[PDB]
Structure 1
Amino acid sequence: RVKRPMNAFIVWSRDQRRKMALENPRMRNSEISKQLGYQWKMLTEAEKWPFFQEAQKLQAMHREKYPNYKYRPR
């Protein structure tokens, strides 16, 4: 079963989730998501663009590998 490709926030959140967890070892993971939300909204456009590029590469490789994939929720 073919999964969705990572958008830019997901791409950026992965390292940032681990680094928050190691520095705040008591927080629930659902509470790290909140902290990652505030931080992302704090990021300037100029800081987030490498992650949108990465998201694009990922959506592009997705269509290479799965040329007939289409998204079907529920």
Structure 2
Amino acid sequence: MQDRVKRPMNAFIVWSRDQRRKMALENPRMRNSEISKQLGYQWKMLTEAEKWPFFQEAQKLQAMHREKYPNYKYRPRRKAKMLPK
């Protein structure tokens, strides 16, 4: 059995993990589909200085993630797509 390595969480995913739970406790009956929309609206209102602390952490998680798997490569699966010429 092989365990697959998941991609490092980006500043928004890390910031949503803790913010998403905050909104769920205050809005435990709101569906993630709507919360995901308000978080994106609120996330776009944060300043770069306020977002910086979350970007640096994602950057640290990415470097630390790279230390665990220094040979890891992002290899997305392509779907059957052929554009006309």
Normalised to the residue count of structure 1, the TM-score between the two structures is 0.93
1:16-68 Cα distance to aligned partner (Å, 9 max, x none): 11111111122101211101100100101111010011001011011111011
Q: CA RMSD in A?
A: 2.8
More displaced stretch, 38-47 vs 19-28? 19-28
Counterpart of 2:38 (choices 35, 40, 50) is: 35
Q: Percent identity?
A: 99
Query: Secondary structure at the residue paired with 2:44?
Result: helix
Query: Secondary structure at the residue paired with 1:35?
Result: helix
Whole-angstrom distance in 2 between the partners of 1:59 and 1:24: 31
Query: Secondary structure at the residue paired with 2:67?
Result: helix
Larger helix proportion of the pair = 1
* Rg larger for: 2
> Is structure 2 residue 75 aligned with structure 1 residue 72?
yes
> How many residues end up aligned between the 2 structures?
74
Which runs of 4 or more aligned residues in structure 1 lie more than 2 Å from their structure 2 counterparts after TM superposition? none
